[PDB]
């Protein structure tokens, strides 16, 4: 049998053997021979006595096969080596007669690709081509202030930006432009321009080693790193303030049964312990320092840190090394806000880019400051802040005084306005949990149809955090990663929608943002148009007692009365409407 190619099962000498009038088989041929042996006639045959099939192809009739195959291989080898030892002599003789100058004209210049990362605007066809797809009656039929078009989108998520995410979602692998962008996002390369080792240089360098990188190499050098630290993967404790779902810190209440070794506490701290425990603690000043001594007595109440083992070890996390500073956000902002608010700012700037609008003020050349809304929203809001006010205040850790503001779901919308837009438009933050981002688009449309805003920034955003993931795994809404390891599933293949073995959703983090405008406005500003928003609707289901149970509310977006469907309505005819206009 001839396995794969060249070396495998001595394929090179196979033709040699065939010369002797023996047949060697491809895998497909030899597979057809074996399947012959399961045809009814051979099966019923094999049921009577054993059957010895010989699919040898007559090779049994070649004498001393061993030494005869060895012989053939020897003649191919000695003919290949002789013709190599003659080609290498003729090469040397050429190189001695023509030197290094007539054999230098044969060396061509290779061009190596650079990454030319495009913004991927929609291609506009010539007017004849775009006039043919729509019905000829459409021209002058639509109110182009009532037509909501999407003008710009971005996201920040486990696979980077919309651009990279698409490449991964469509082609299961990055191009050159993808690999570069993902590298740049995850920090694996910065861009240098000036003196490097004194010598002037321009282009990418490694971020760690400050070594020149060329674009052709960035795939080879950092693909593995990128694929390993991107997407759905094992939770990293760096990205969540040392949260390890293996060792999830709890505390536990114990009644102290024997006095504690007296310890040092400042006056205030001691008096705090005295107000809490009352008689169960004894405080005494130490005259020398003025620092107090505290002693817990029998029957006091102490909190022993334990540690639990949670079974949701995997989650869709923004690529390791993602950093708002990269996109150009300042440290005074990064400190102040919840990481969610970074994902939103980066989504909004990158969505504007994609829309062609670099300086948002440009939008106020064409609209009044009261006409640019922000109908985006979140399901759960700034959960880093909420953890910083409920756990990290309770544990008297140093938390900023204005943590409450940062927690509030609308704050991310507000922070956009305060840094980028500086509008006075409608500000409607919807909370729809998983459906928020669609409730947002619904609000956005309605806000623009109402006339209150000509442009709205819609979308959703949610962070992922210890307390969420724990409470999702308690409800049994998420996948149980230890059950998936028993099933052999690697992380990458744990989100498997519509499959038989789906048991729970992978929880992820990040934002998505679209810019929606009236078509008329969009055409006037000359902003790209990635699609019309023909319809957006929400719908609650029905009377029940299970809040997370999804229903058939949205089915209502297809209601129509079919009692009188005998003669098609003249209303559904475009010529009729156009005439009546």
């Amino acid at each position: 049998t001839r396995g794969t190619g060249l070396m495998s099962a001595n394929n090179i000498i196979a033709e040699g053997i065939e010369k002797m009038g023996v047949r060697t088989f491809s895998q497909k041929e030899m597979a057809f021979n074996l399947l012959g042996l399961l045809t009814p006639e051979v099966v019923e045959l094999c049921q009577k006595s054993p059957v010895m099939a010989d699919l040898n192809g007559g090779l049994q009739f070649v004498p001393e096969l061993k030494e005869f195959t060895a012989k053939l291989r020897k003649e191919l080898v000695e003919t290949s080596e002789v013709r190599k030892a003659v080609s290498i002599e003729t090469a040397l003789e050429h190189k001695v007669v023509n030197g290094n100058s007539a054999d230098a004209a044969y060396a061509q210049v290779e061009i190596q690709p650079r990454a030319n990362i495009q913004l991927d605007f929609p291609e506009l066809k010539p007017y004849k081509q775009v006039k043919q797809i729509a019905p000829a009656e459409l021209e002058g039929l639509l109110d182009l202030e009532r037509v909501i078009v999407v003008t710009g989108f971005a996201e920040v998520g486990p696979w980077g930006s919309a651009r990279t995410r698409w490449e991964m979602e469509a082609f299961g692998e990055f191009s050159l432009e993808g690999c570069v962008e993902m590298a740049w996002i995850m920090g694996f390369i910065s861009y240098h321009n000036g003196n490097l080792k004194g010598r002037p240089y321009t282009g990418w360098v490694d971020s760690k080693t400050k070594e020149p990188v060329d674009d052709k190499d960035v795939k080879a050098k950092y693909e593995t790193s990128i694929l390993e630290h991107s997407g759905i993967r094992l939770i990293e404790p760096e990205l969540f303030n040392g949260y390890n779902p293996e060792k999830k810190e709890m505390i536990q209440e114990v009644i102290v049964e024997e006095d504690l070794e007296p310890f040092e506490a400042s006056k205030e701290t001691a008096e705090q312990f005295k107000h809490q425990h009352g008689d169960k603690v004894d405080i005494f000043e130490i005259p020398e320092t003025g620092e107090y001594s505290v002693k817990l007595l029998k029957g006091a109440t102490l909190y022993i840190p334990k540690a639990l083992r949670f079974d949701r070890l995997v989650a869709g996390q923004i690529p390791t090394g993602w950093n708002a500073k990269t996109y150009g956000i300042s440290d005074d902002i990064i400190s102040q806000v919840d990481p969610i608010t970074l994902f939103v700012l980066v989504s909004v700037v990158e969505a504007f880019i994609a829309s062609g609008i670099t300086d948002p003020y440009e939008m106020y050349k064409y609209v009044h400051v009261s006409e640019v809304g922000n109908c985006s929203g979140s399901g759960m809001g700034g959960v880093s802040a909420l953890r910083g006010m409920f756990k990290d205040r309770f544990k008297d850790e140093p938390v900023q005084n204005d943590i409450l503001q940062e927690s509030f779901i609308n704050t991310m919308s507000a922070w956009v306005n305060m840094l980028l837009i500086s509008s006075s438009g409608p500000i409607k933050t919807p909370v729809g949990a998983c459906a928020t981002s669609v409730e947002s688009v619904d609000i956005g449309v309605e806000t623009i149809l109402s006339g209150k805003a000509r442009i709205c920034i819609v979308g959703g955003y949610d962070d992922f955090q210890e307390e969420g993931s724990f409470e999702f795994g308690n409800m049994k809404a998420t996948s149980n990663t230890l059950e998936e390891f028993e099933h052999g599933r690697t992380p990458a293949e744990m989100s498997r929608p519509a499959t038989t073995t789906r048991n729970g959703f992978m929880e992820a983090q990040g934002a998505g943002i679209q810019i929606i405008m009236q078509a008329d406005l969009a055409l006037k500003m000359g902003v790209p148009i990635y699609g019309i928003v023909a319809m957006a609707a929400t719908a609650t289901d029905k009377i029940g007692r299970s809040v997370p149970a999804p229903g058939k509310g949205i089915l209502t977006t297809a209601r129509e009365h079919h009692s009188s469907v005998k003669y098609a309505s003249p209303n559904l005819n475009m010529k009729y409407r156009k005439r009546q206009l």
């Binding site: 605007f121 729509a134 486990p158 880019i353 399901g379 293949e493 297809a558 209601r559």
Partner: protein
């Protein structure tokens, strides 16, 4: 005129109970129900949601009498990203737009074996590999949240808008885009190599003297300041009779 265009071109179905708000919103741009090629599914990968979603969409298409053997192509984006709760739709929408302006319908690459129950849903196809079609015309984004939150949104290929305008206005637009696309491309690469895509505004476009003046004048716009080189409200373009 606009209200006249509205009554016939845009909102011809908002009273008629023989036209489904889905049917209408496709019919506006002279598309039949058979033109909704792709449905972007919530597809969380949980027992309950995925069967109830598929049943819903299958029943919409079956009521609206979408032709037998013309199933929507389901795209389950969440095999790759995972489910980011509130941002889920906003990813799916981005995915829908990318599908429209590419003709490429991605494939659920983790769809090892589609659940046998989903067979009963004729109008839903569950592809396991990317299909390069000759064009999508419309995409249905459907989400289902906690607390009976249930959304849908249709998104129609932008080329059905250009139908609506004249050759001259089209040509003006195409010019103005091709120019902006170039400026944006410039600003993007500059930003990316010098870490300055994000530039926080230090000032409102209006000074605190003009704040109220600008709010109260509906036709107040920003004009290129000659000195600063930014866009700011000038005191001669607020309550301006011109």
């Amino acid at each position: 005129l606009r209200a006249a265009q509205q009554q016939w071109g845009n909102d011809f179905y908002k009273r008629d109970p023989r036209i489904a708000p889905l049917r209408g919103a496709l019919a506006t741009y002279g598309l039949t129900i058979d033109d909704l090629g792709v449905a972007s599914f919530h597809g969380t990968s949980t027992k309950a949601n995925d069967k109830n979603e598929s049943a819903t969409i299958n029943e919409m298409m079956k009521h609206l009498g979408r032709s037998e053997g013309n199933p929507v192509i389901g795209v389950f984006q969440k095999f790759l990203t995972g489910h980011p709760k509130g941002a889920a739709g906003a990813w799916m929408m981005n995915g829908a737009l990318q599908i429209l302006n590419s003709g490429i319908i991605p494939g659920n690459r983790n769809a090892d074996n589609v659940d046998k129950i989903l067979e009963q849903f004729e109008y839903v196809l569950y592809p396991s590999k990317t299909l390069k079609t000759d064009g999508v015309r419309a995409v249905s984004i459907t989400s289902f949240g906690f607390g009976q939150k249930g959304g849908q949104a249709i998104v129609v290929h932008p080329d059905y808008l250009y139908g609506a305008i004249t050759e001259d206005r089209y040509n003006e637009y195409v010019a103005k885009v091709s120019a902006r696309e170039k400026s944006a491309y410039k600003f993007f690469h500059n930003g990316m190599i010098y870490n300055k895509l994000f530039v926080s505004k230090e000032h409102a476009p209006y000074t605190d003297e003009l704040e109220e003046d600008v709010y109260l004048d509906p036709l107040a716009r920003v004009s290129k300041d000659k000195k600063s080189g930014s866009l700011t409200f000038n005191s001669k373009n607020i309550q301006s009779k011109d």
